[PDB]
A and B are shown apart, each in its own frame.
Chain A
Amino acid sequence: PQKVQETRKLVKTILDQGHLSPFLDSLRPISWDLDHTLTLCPIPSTMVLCDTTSAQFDLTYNGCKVINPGSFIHNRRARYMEYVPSSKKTIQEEIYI
């Protein structure tokens, strides 16, 4: 499916690239001192990679579990995500409104 393919493309790009902002500073400026915080070099155990313009997902890649909770209010539904650290499950949740 298109949504799966594009979200796999997203997280695989970010984690292979190892760094949350692969773009040139001319396209996304970085405070030069604090670029070390955008780097991921010992890849995090989980990542809440919140993105307003892609489907909700909870992929795993290289043992890194990457969850996007997406937009809070979408398609007349409020949306939020319950990450369980002691099992690394990810129960999505919603309310109609």
Chain B
Amino acid sequence: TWEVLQYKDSGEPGVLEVFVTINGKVQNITFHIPKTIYMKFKSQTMPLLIEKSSASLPNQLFKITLPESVFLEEKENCTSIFNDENVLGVFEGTITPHQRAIMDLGASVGFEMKDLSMGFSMDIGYLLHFPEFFSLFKSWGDTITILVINASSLGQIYKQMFEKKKGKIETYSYLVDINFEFVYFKLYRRLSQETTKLKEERGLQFLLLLQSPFITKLLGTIRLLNQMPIVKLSTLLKKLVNHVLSSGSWISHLIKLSQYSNIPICNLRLDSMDYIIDVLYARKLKKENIVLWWNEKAPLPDHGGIQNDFDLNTSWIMNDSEFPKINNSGVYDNVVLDVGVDNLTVNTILTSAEFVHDAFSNDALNVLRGMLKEWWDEALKENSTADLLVNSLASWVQNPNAKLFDGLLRYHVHNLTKKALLQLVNEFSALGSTIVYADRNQILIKTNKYSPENCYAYSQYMMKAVRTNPMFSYLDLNIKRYWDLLIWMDKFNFSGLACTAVSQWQLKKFLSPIYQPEFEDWMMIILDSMLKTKQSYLKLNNSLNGFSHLFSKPLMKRVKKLFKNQQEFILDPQYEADYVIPVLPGSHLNVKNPLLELVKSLCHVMLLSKSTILEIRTLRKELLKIFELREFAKVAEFKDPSLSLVVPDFLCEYCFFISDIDFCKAAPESIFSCVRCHKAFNQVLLQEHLIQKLRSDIESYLIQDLRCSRCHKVKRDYMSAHCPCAGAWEGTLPRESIVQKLNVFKQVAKYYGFDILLSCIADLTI
């Protein structure tokens, strides 16, 4: 037969049941498929179908082909070529039969696979369950069944949503068409009763839409008659009615995905574009004759048995991710461009280009590049599915659940991304500008220019001059803000005037409550003074020279008064609540004088002004005189109150955004929700990522190399007591730093109420 709607494996080995379409009708049919396998030796043997072969391995090779029955009846049942005899290891043996068929047959295809080779218009059914509320529907019936106000709200909510979605329904009415009755319910026997009644009304010629993100999928297949062809999918009844009326657009989108990807409708998942990318990449890899590292059973890339073992390169590859993000703090009287960036992963994969043993295979990378060029061209021609694919590639290169996931691939892509971000910085600086900040999503650039109204032409020139270089052909360079004047120490602690004044300071959050308003007020005064001085200098014509003189004496008067008030009231139960220093994530250190903490913060912000250090320094002295603190006393030195706890490369799937998020320096809204869209993140997912980071650091401590404490050589041997240069061995990750990391983890867990991470921390000790 010459078109497919579903594959699924029979109970017996090597046999598929298949659902095919011809002459209008769906038909059930059955295919017999061999298991292709590769084996490797460093000696010849050929006792037995077996064939000598050649194909690139992942970083003497024979192809082998059996029906799965005899393979199973030999491999773990008989002394055979599958046992010992210098096998360096099987490779593709994990690929399930239907997952082989989906690659080599597609949709545009008992019956032997040896002779098989490479307008929907039918009925739909529906079963979405919202855990008690198993909900049922047919595209050829007039009532909806729900398991255990109801009727009234259902009828009018249907009418309302139907009115809201008339054209959207009508344009897909022929796929799925509308008013209906309803009924609301040991009770799980009804599900088998309903599904059997459906089968009796339609033995074939109808398609079943299963479930939605509150999944119970496997138990669903237990209650459901397993023999249907099924599209698997992963007073608040508005949700349900909206899904019902969404159905036709879903079928349209799925048909578009299938017709593009050449994948049957039942097998692909809307929930993971990574799987579509997997099957398509697998097709091109085998068509370019690469031995395929597809893994069905585990995340790890199936290199044969060797992926079971620990390896120091592999563990470094898996553990490591952090960009060498640049942060040049200072005051900037120049205009600063807030350059947003996107498509850096896509751009670098496109613009990319043993002796090297953790590089991903150059052949497979070439296939990924050429295939991404193919997808990109089809996105330029507005294949919406191809654009959705290219946007989703950043997930697939990182997602361990991808069938062709490889740690070396993730790392090869990652460090290429790093190198290209540095080359982008090199280009911007080569154009005479200077970089305030840079990471994988953003660059802030000093312009060597003084007014935004002069620069709206020059900025677009600059951005175009970058993107016209071939190295950056595909970047989404976007001037997201214009800063007239910028005070900057990190991306959680800055203020400036934009073209209108904004101020955000994690520094502020660690001051006691009575002084937090005071800090903001003086920040506005400092910005106003810097502005007045900038424009004053520009009317006379580093422009900041003398800006302290517009407010210094008022500031010292104010601080004398506040010091008197603190001596009056810090002890007082009437006022002590506003002098309590807050407990916070990454709360670095203790402090005994909160006014001194405010003054330290204000002086530190002003000491960012590289041109003017002397006037701020003298003002800092005369302020610290108020406390009888010496100018260089360690009590008066500024150390950042926030200890960063960054989770690298966190993914917002709703907009495919790859952000490092800092649980201490970020504001809580930027932790619990995205910062390009504003969808919220799942709490258990987030705790899981923190546990992955915690265990990554414990492992990274335990697997570390030791280093000689005076000549800094690495300890190359297993049983020396000290280095041959007489120096003792010391860790490259000293224990103190790891205790500090665990301390910030316990603080973060206590504050945000992360129960699972807290249990993990507790189970380390106890």
Residue ranges of A at the interface with B (Cβ–Cβ < 8 Å): 2, 6, 24-32, 74-75
| Alpha-carbon separation in the docked complex, A17 to B312 (Å) | 24
Closest to B309 in A: A27
Q: Are B76 and A74 in contact (CB under 8 A)?
A: yes
Q: Are B310 and A27 in contact (CB under 8 A)?
A: yes
Cβ of B733 to closest chain A Cβ, rounded Å? 13
Q: Are A31 and B702 in contact (CB under 8 A)?
A: yes
User: Which residues from A are CB-within-8-Å of B83?
Assistant: 2
Q: Are B84 and A2 in contact (CB under 8 A)?
A: yes
| Alpha-carbon separation in the docked complex, A25 to B717 (Å) | 12
| Alpha-carbon separation in the docked complex, A89 to B77 (Å) | 27
Cβ of A64 to closest chain B Cβ, rounded Å? 26
| Alpha-carbon separation in the docked complex, A61 to B720 (Å) | 34
Cβ of B341 to closest chain A Cβ, rounded Å? 38
User: Which residues from B are CB-within-8-Å of A25?
Assistant: 703
Closest to A53 in B: B305
Is B355's CB within 8 Å of the partner chain A?
no
Which interface residue of A27, A29, A75 has the most chain B CB atoms within 10 A? A29
User: Which residues from B are CB-within-8-Å of A28?
Assistant: 309-310
Is B718's CB within 8 Å of the partner chain A?
yes
Q: Are A29 and B702 in contact (CB under 8 A)?
A: yes
Q: Are A75 and B310 in contact (CB under 8 A)?
A: no
Residue pairs across A and B with Cβ atoms less than 8 A apart, 22 shown, are: A2-B79, A2-B83, A2-B84, A6-B84, A24-B718, A25-B703, A26-B312, A27-B309, A27-B310, A27-B311, A28-B309, A28-B310, A29-B310, A29-B699, A29-B702, A29-B703, A30-B702, A31-B702, A32-B702, A74-B76, A75-B76, A75-B77
Mark each residue of chain B from 305 to 326: 1 if its CB lies under 8 Å from any CB of chain A, else 0: 0000111100000000000000
User: Which residues from B are CB-within-8-Å of A2?
Assistant: 79, 83-84
User: Which residues from B are CB-within-8-Å of A31?
Assistant: 702
| Alpha-carbon separation in the docked complex, A27 to B312 (Å) | 8
User: Which residues from B are CB-within-8-Å of A26?
Assistant: 312
User: Which residues from B are CB-within-8-Å of A74?
Assistant: 76
Residue ranges of B at the interface with A (Cβ–Cβ < 8 Å): 76-77, 79, 83-84, 309-312, 699, 702-703, 718
Cβ of A35 to closest chain B Cβ, rounded Å? 11
User: Which residues from B are CB-within-8-Å of A6?
Assistant: 84
Closest to B308 in A: A53
By Cβ-Cβ distance, the 5 closest A-B pairs, closest first, are A29-B703, A26-B312, A29-B702, A28-B310, A31-B702
Given A28-B310, A29-B703, 19 more A-B residue pairs with CB atoms under 8 Å apart are A2-B79, A2-B83, A2-B84, A6-B84, A24-B718, A25-B703, A26-B312, A27-B309, A27-B310, A27-B311, A28-B309, A29-B310, A29-B699, A29-B702, A30-B702, A31-B702, A32-B702, A74-B76, A75-B77
| Alpha-carbon separation in the docked complex, A24 to B312 (Å) | 11
| Alpha-carbon separation in the docked complex, A29 to B698 (Å) | 12
User: Which residues from A are CB-within-8-Å of B311?
Assistant: 27
| Alpha-carbon separation in the docked complex, A28 to B308 (Å) | 11
User: Which residues from B are CB-within-8-Å of A27?
Assistant: 309-311
User: Which residues from B are CB-within-8-Å of A29?
Assistant: 310, 699, 702-703
| Alpha-carbon separation in the docked complex, A2 to B83 (Å) | 10
| Alpha-carbon separation in the docked complex, A32 to B729 (Å) | 15
User: Which residues from A are CB-within-8-Å of B703?
Assistant: 25, 29
| Alpha-carbon separation in the docked complex, A74 to B83 (Å) | 16
User: Which residues from A are CB-within-8-Å of B309?
Assistant: 27-28
| Alpha-carbon separation in the docked complex, A30 to B310 (Å) | 11
Cβ of A55 to closest chain B Cβ, rounded Å? 11
User: Which residues from A are CB-within-8-Å of B310?
Assistant: 27-29
| Alpha-carbon separation in the docked complex, A31 to B701 (Å) | 10
Closest to B72 in A: A75
| Alpha-carbon separation in the docked complex, A26 to B84 (Å) | 25
Closest to B718 in A: A24
Cβ of A28 to closest chain B Cβ, rounded Å? 6
| Alpha-carbon separation in the docked complex, A25 to B705 (Å) | 11
User: Which residues from B are CB-within-8-Å of A30?
Assistant: 702
Closest to B83 in A: A2
Closest to B704 in A: A29
Closest to A24 in B: B718
Cβ of A66 to closest chain B Cβ, rounded Å? 21
Closest to A1 in B: B79
Closest to B305 in A: A53
User: Which residues from A are CB-within-8-Å of B77?
Assistant: 75
| Alpha-carbon separation in the docked complex, A6 to B77 (Å) | 16
User: Which residues from A are CB-within-8-Å of B84?
Assistant: 2, 6
| Alpha-carbon separation in the docked complex, A26 to B313 (Å) | 10
Cβ of B149 to closest chain A Cβ, rounded Å? 49
| Alpha-carbon separation in the docked complex, A27 to B703 (Å) | 10
Closest to B312 in A: A26
Closest to B79 in A: A2
Cβ of B425 to closest chain A Cβ, rounded Å? 36
User: Which residues from B are CB-within-8-Å of A75?
Assistant: 76-77
Closest to A74 in B: B76
Closest to B84 in A: A2
Cβ of B86 to closest chain A Cβ, rounded Å? 14
| Alpha-carbon separation in the docked complex, A41 to B312 (Å) | 29
Cβ of A27 to closest chain B Cβ, rounded Å? 6
User: Which residues from A are CB-within-8-Å of B718?
Assistant: 24
| Alpha-carbon separation in the docked complex, A31 to B310 (Å) | 14
Cβ of B763 to closest chain A Cβ, rounded Å? 15
Which interface residue of B76, B311, B702 has the most chain A CB atoms within 10 A? B702
| Alpha-carbon separation in the docked complex, A29 to B79 (Å) | 34
Cβ of B418 to closest chain A Cβ, rounded Å? 26
| Alpha-carbon separation in the docked complex, A75 to B76 (Å) | 8
Cβ of B15 to closest chain A Cβ, rounded Å? 17
Which interface residue of B76, B79, B310, B718 has the most chain A CB atoms within 10 A? B310
User: Which residues from A are CB-within-8-Å of B312?
Assistant: 26
| Alpha-carbon separation in the docked complex, A27 to B311 (Å) | 6
Which interface residue of A26, A28, A30, A32 has the most chain B CB atoms within 10 A? A26
| Alpha-carbon separation in the docked complex, A2 to B309 (Å) | 24
Closest to B76 in A: A75
Cβ of A48 to closest chain B Cβ, rounded Å? 21
Closest to A32 in B: B702
Cβ of B652 to closest chain A Cβ, rounded Å? 33
| Alpha-carbon separation in the docked complex, A54 to B288 (Å) | 37
| Alpha-carbon separation in the docked complex, A26 to B717 (Å) | 11
Closest to A33 in B: B702
| Alpha-carbon separation in the docked complex, A27 to B315 (Å) | 11
| Alpha-carbon separation in the docked complex, A25 to B718 (Å) | 9
Cβ of B8 to closest chain A Cβ, rounded Å? 21
Closest to B705 in A: A26
Closest to A2 in B: B79
Cβ of B47 to closest chain A Cβ, rounded Å? 16
Closest to A71 in B: B76
Closest to A29 in B: B703
| Alpha-carbon separation in the docked complex, A2 to B80 (Å) | 11
| Alpha-carbon separation in the docked complex, A30 to B702 (Å) | 8
Cβ of B641 to closest chain A Cβ, rounded Å? 34
| Alpha-carbon separation in the docked complex, A27 to B76 (Å) | 27
| Alpha-carbon separation in the docked complex, A23 to B360 (Å) | 27
Cβ of A71 to closest chain B Cβ, rounded Å? 9
Closest to A3 in B: B79
User: Which residues from A are CB-within-8-Å of B79?
Assistant: 2
Cβ of B219 to closest chain A Cβ, rounded Å? 21
| Alpha-carbon separation in the docked complex, A28 to B540 (Å) | 71
| Alpha-carbon separation in the docked complex, A20 to B310 (Å) | 16
